[PDB]
Amino acid sequence: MGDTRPRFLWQLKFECHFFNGTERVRLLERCIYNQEESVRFDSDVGEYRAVTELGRPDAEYWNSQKDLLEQRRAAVDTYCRHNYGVGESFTVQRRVEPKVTVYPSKTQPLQHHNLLVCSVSGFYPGSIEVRWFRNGQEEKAGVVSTGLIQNGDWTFQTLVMLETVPRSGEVYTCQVEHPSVTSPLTVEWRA
Amino acid sequence: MIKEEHVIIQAEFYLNPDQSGEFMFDFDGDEIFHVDMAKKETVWRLEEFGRFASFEAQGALANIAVDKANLEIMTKRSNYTPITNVPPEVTVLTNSPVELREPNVLICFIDKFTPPVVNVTWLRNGKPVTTGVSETVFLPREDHLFRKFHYLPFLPSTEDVYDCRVEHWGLDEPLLKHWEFDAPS
């Protein structure tokens, strides 16, 4: 690196939490000094509260300003529900179909293919179900998931491995359900 | 299942003596937009979002100014206590399954660190590469540490090796995260 001067960080977070669409909305404003949250306003509480002793004077000082408080107490409507309405169509309601592929892999360097991997990628939202079949019969044991990986670009991926050493005549199926499709996507593979 | 909770977070920060500030919105862990401080502009994470919403960047600059003024007050109040360095964990993966000679993207995922100052270098066969690279701003975490992504478009090959080199004040030496084609899983 370089320049080891000491650092001083302040973070502000306004968290709008939404449950069942906008049936319940909660604002949590959080003030953080050096990774240490010091003070917050929770709309369910309705005034500032000190999280550590460092934040107390702010709590007291801001709670003393009646017009600032009334603004924050209205923020669930004027800020949270407003912004939910602005972004909903391209965020909450975003649907992108997954790409599915199956390829063989190995648990250890050198030894032969002892896995089938079903890669599910490019999809949004995160809700996905993956099932493995060998000759149309579901494989339950030996199935292992990475779970959900966020790519940083409004897509996810996940890898679902089946422990198996494929033999000729076996047809393996990866089947995938996701909100973007009304029937399951299936991809077949054979050795 | 239909997802029950969603969270939108407007996350800001100011860091001294760097004098670097950031303003961004996060939805369920993905960046909706940030404001570029030098250019003073709203930058939407996907170009198409800006066809649907707008954001006045000048307001974000005003917030960062208040945030600056509070940081300085807090810095005295805490009697100049500095942030403790927390070094990142790094993961490199591809965004799609790797096929020989089919264009792909390497993803360097830098996680669980603070302060938000990091150097990331893509190395192909031990030599820096910059062609086509892109990166995100710092993204928030519930524990108040940061996330970041860097991206390297590439053409998979049996001959090339890659390293994401990450440097940070909390690391003794640069962290080298290796990737190559056909690695076991």
Binding site: L12, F14, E29, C31, P57, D58, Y61, W62, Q65, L68, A75, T78, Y79, H82, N83, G85, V86, G87 | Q10, E12, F25, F33, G50, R51, F52, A53, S54, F55, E56, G59, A60, A62, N63, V66, D67, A69, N70, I73, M74, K76, R77
Partner: peptide, 17 residues
Amino acid sequence: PVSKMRMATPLLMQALP
């Protein structure tokens, strides 16, 4: 017609002296 995303504004801390 683009919707405006709103920002919330941080409160100033009390000056030290």
